[PDB]
Amino acid sequence: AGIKVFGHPASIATRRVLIALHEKNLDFELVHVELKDGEHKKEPFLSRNPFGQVPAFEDGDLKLFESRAITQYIAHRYENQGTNLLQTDSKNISQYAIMAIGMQVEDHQFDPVASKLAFEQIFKSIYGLTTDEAVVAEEEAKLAKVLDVYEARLKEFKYLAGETFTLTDLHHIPAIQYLLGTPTKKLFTERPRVNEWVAEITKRPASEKVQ
């Protein structure tokens, strides 16, 4: 009964779902999945997601996985509550397509690079691993290209999909929160519109709740 999220509060993909729920002021339960004990690779979690990845999700009888399918579900199902995470006119098909391009770009261009950069610079340090400075330089060069495109985009519009905050922006937040604690931060601060966009989206109450 009600809304449940099956994940881990440090997980980027889990936080993506958590932020959207808070944006909608929805009540939910966070059911912790213990990644260190391989709980995500065992039953009964595998019955919620056979690919063994956090998060999984429940709204009454509806069972979901994949963070970006979950956020979009939340944005449609609870459209008329809290922050609107869709475009202002959500029935406008061309406007939706524009938001969708950005969501695809976050997934394909931004997320894999931002992840490697977080792994090399934060998570390797945890254990006993030295950060490979060549990977860092190569990935930062890739991230810089992505952010150059974003800079051009944000000269034209207040947010990535148009004049309002949407899922396109929201999906970037968790990876950005981690990158802000690394020297990769400079890539954001050296680009004026990107920098303002990062400051706006990370200062939101829903973003701060999961941090």
Ligand X SMILES: O=c1c(O)c(-c2ccc(O)c(O)c2)oc2cc(O)cc(O)c12
Whether residue 126 is annotated as binding a ligand: the answer is no
Q: Which of 2, 10, 41, 69 binds ligand X (CB under 6 A)?
A: 69
Whether residue 11 is annotated as binding a ligand: the answer is yes
Whether residue 94 is annotated as binding a ligand: the answer is no
To ligand X, the closest distance from the beta carbon of 36 in angstroms equals 29
Stretch that binds ligand X, among 2-10, 70-78, 131-139, 176-184 (CB under 6 A): 70-78
For a second copy, the closer of residues 53 and 83 by Cβ is 53
Q: How far apart are CA 118 and CA 140, in angstroms?
A: 11
Place of tokens 């051009």: 152
Q: Return the closest-CA partner of residue 143 out of 185, 95, 97.
A: 185
To a second copy, the closest distance from the beta carbon of 165 in angstroms equals 19
For ligand X, the closer of residues 73 and 119 by Cβ is 73
Main-chain dihedrals φ then ψ at residue 136, nearest 5 degrees: -60, -45
To ligand X, the closest distance from the beta carbon of 6 in angstroms equals 18
**Contact of 191 with 129, CB cutoff 8 Å:** no
Looking at the DSSP assignment, which residues form a beta bridge with residue 57? 5, 64
Whether residue 53 is annotated as binding a ligand: the answer is yes
By CB under 6 A, tell whether 97 contacts ligand X.
yes
Binders of ligand X among 77-96, rule CB under 6 A?
A: 93, 96
Residue 5 touches which member of a second copy, ligand X, none, C-beta under 5-8 Å by kind: none
Whole-number Cα distances in Å, 51 to 60, 64, 170:
22, 12, 24
Q: 3-class SS at 30? A: strand
Q: How far apart are CA 61 and CA 4, in angstroms?
A: 11
Whether residue 67 is annotated as binding a ligand: the answer is yes
The radius of gyration computed from the CA coordinates of the chain, to the nearest angstrom, equals: 17
Whether residue 66 is annotated as binding a ligand: the answer is yes
- Residue ranges for the binding site for glutathione? 11-12, 40-41, 53-54, 66-67
- The residues binding ligand X (CB under 6 A) are 69, 72-73, 76, 93, 96-97, 100
